[PDB]
Design a protein around this ligand. Structure first.
Ligand SMILES: *[C@@H]1O[C@H](CO)[C@@H](O[C@@H]2O[C@H](CO)[C@@H](O[C@@H]3O[C@H](CO)[C@@H](O)[C@H](O[C@H]4O[C@H](CO)[C@@H](O)[C@H](O)[C@@H]4O)[C@@H]3O)[C@H](O)[C@H]2NC(C)=O)[C@H](O)[C@H]1NC(C)=O
Ligand SMILES: CCCCCCCCCCCCCCCCCCCCCCCCOC(=O)CCCCCCCCCCCCCCCCC
Ligand SMILES: *[C@@H]1O[C@H](CO)[C@@H](O[C@@H]2O[C@H](CO)[C@@H](O[C@@H]3O[C@H](CO)[C@@H](O)[C@H](O)[C@@H]3O)[C@H](O)[C@H]2NC(C)=O)[C@H](O)[C@H]1NC(C)=O
Ligand SMILES: *[C@@H]1O[C@H](CO)[C@@H](O)[C@H](O)[C@H]1NC(C)=O
Ligand SMILES: OC[C@H]1O[C@H](O)[C@@H](O)[C@@H](O)[C@@H]1O
Ligand SMILES: [Cl-]
Ligand code: NA
Ligand code: NA
Ligand code: NA
Lengths: 98, 273
């Protein structure tokens, strides 16, 4: 019995180009615990990305928060890439702007 | 939920040669202890993470956990065969105590095997979970014989934990008892269909956790509001999105209203405009 990860991307503050910000990728509901998560700037892994120690929920499924400081640009696209045993191929979830 | 302190463990048993454990301690959702596996020492993430406990008691608790983690993997490797465990498998544990309305502090301990209920503690005895099967009943009838393990668990659950919880609740009141105002902003999502639109209200930075967000036509609660999950930021604040599937023109004079305990009765109201 495995549980595939739910993957939600969001910014701490509303997107203002030139203003510093924080991009978050919350991953949850997965079992077992081994997982690979990256943030992408125009398809490229971001280097210094913090993340939380492993935790899990009432139902024993695991969750992690990955985040990084950044400053969005009109040209820049951002996403979150997650690999997990239940994923036959890496899953990407983009950060939506208006 | 009720206020709670607890430590957790995740243990991965890959082959009989290899195992790995991760541990941490938590006030509800807020982590206050890490564990350096590679050096068998605790990590205190807040200045008040020791509670009102002395450096003597903290060092004692640290040594019990270090010995337990060291010992737990070895004892599982040892008993794997007699339990007929096939590698790889994994185990999780949570133990702690929670303060309940009415003053009574209730202690708990729960273990899982492969993400499935395996055992829990009640009346200071081992209680096999129906989902744990033959192995769970075998485990509880076995562990009950090791009275030193049972003694230490009994003391930590019922003596140490209630004291430590009150101690730490008070010790960290400056961080635990504060009001942080959210910012909120509107945006347009991916349209559900044609002519249709998805109105999006973001609410970010609030503390504590409870919050209320609804899409409003004046004083009318739009019952179609879909509430996302509350999601964490790094600085002990939260994030929440409320969306509404609406036809264009139907999104005329719609507002997003945010009630939160930090706003002093002044709800944030964002008109679609
Ligand atoms: C860390 O903090 C915890 C939590 O506060 C602390 O444990 C608590 O200590 C207080 C004393 O500081 C205890 O209060 C006493 O409890 C007894 C029986 O439970 C009562 O009978 C007492 O009432 C009399 O004494 C008071 C004077 O302190 C008078 O004001 C009162 O009117 C009565 O005459 C007294 O309230 C409390 O019960 C414990 N609670 C628990 C769950 O342990 C702990 O000692 C601190 N330090 C450490 C190292 O843990
Ligand atoms: C015998 C036969 C042994 C038999 C073994 C047979 C093998 C197969 C059976 C599988 C059974 C699996 C289920 C067993 C349950 C195991 C977990 C039990 O639950 C716990 O242990 C509760 C959690 C304990 C957490 C400890 C980890 C702590 C990490 C560090 C936290 C930081 C603390 C810092 C605090 C500083 C001071 C306040
Ligand atoms: C028992 O299980 C352990 C853990 O699964 C096995 O150790 C693993 O052995 C492989 C052998 O190559 C290691 O793979 C390498 O990992 C690095 C990353 O660290 C990667 O960049 C390489 O390309 C390569 O894939 C792996 O690291 C190692 N795991 C650990 C945790 O050390 C071990 O072989 C098993 N032994 C038996 C007898 O079953
Ligand atoms: C807990 O409940 C059991 C019920 O069978 C009782 O026999 C026991 O005395 C209680 N207290 C303990 C185990 O400390
Ligand atoms: O240990 C729990 C705590 O509250 C109760 C009393 O019996 C005290 O002596 C004790 O310190
Ligand atoms: Cl959300
Ligand atoms: Na840490
Ligand atoms: Na030690
Ligand atoms: Na953040």
């Amino acid at each position: 019995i495995q549980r595939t990860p739910k993957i939600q991307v969001y910014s701490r503050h509303p997107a203002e180009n030139g203003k510093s910000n924080f991009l978050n990728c919350y991953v949850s509901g997965f079992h077992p615990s081994d997982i690979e998560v990256d943030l992408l700037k125009n398809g490229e892994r971001i280097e210094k990305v913090e993340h939380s120690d492993l935790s899990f929920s009432k139902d024993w499924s695991f969750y992690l928060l990955y985040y990084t400081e950044f400053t969005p640009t009109e040209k820049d696209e951002y996403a979150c890439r997650v690999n997990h045993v239940t994923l036959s191929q890496p899953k990407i979830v983009k950060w939506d702007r208006d | 939920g009720p206020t709670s302190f607890h430590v957790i463990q995740t243990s991965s048993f890959t082959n009989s040669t290899w195992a790995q454990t991760q541990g941490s301690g938590w006030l509800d959702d807020l982590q206050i202890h890490g564990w350096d596996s590679d050096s068998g020492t605790a990590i205190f993430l807040k200045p008040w993470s020791k509670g009102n406990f002395s450096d003597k008691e903290v060092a004692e608790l640290e040594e019990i956990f270090r010995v337990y983690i060291f010992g737990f993997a070895r004892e599982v490797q040892d008993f794997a065969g007699d339990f007929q465990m096939k590698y790889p498998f994994e185990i999780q544990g949570i133990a702690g105590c929670e303060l309940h309305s009415g003053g009574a502090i209730v202690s708990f301990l729960r273990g899982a095997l492969g993400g499935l209920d395996f055992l829990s503690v009640k009346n200071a005895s081992c209680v096999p979970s129906p989902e744990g099967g033959s192995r769970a009943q075998k485990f509880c009838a076995l562990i009950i014989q090791y009275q030193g393990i049972m003694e230490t668990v009994r003391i930590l659950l019922y003596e140490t934990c209630p004291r430590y919880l009150l101690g730490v609740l008070n010790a960290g009141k400056a961080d635990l008892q504060r009001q942080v105002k959210p910012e909120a902003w509107l945006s347009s999502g991916p349209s559900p269909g044609p002519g249709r639109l998805q109105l999006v209200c973001h609410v970010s930075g609030f503390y504590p956790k409870p919050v209320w967000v609804m899409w409003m036509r004046g004083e009318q609660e739009q019952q179609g509001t879909q509430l996302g999950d509350i999601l964490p930021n790094a600085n002990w604040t939260w994030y929440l999105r409320a969306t509404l599937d609406v036809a264009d023109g139907e999104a005329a004079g719609l507002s997003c209203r945010v009630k939160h305990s930090s706003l002093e009765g002044q709800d944030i109201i964002l008109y679609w405009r």
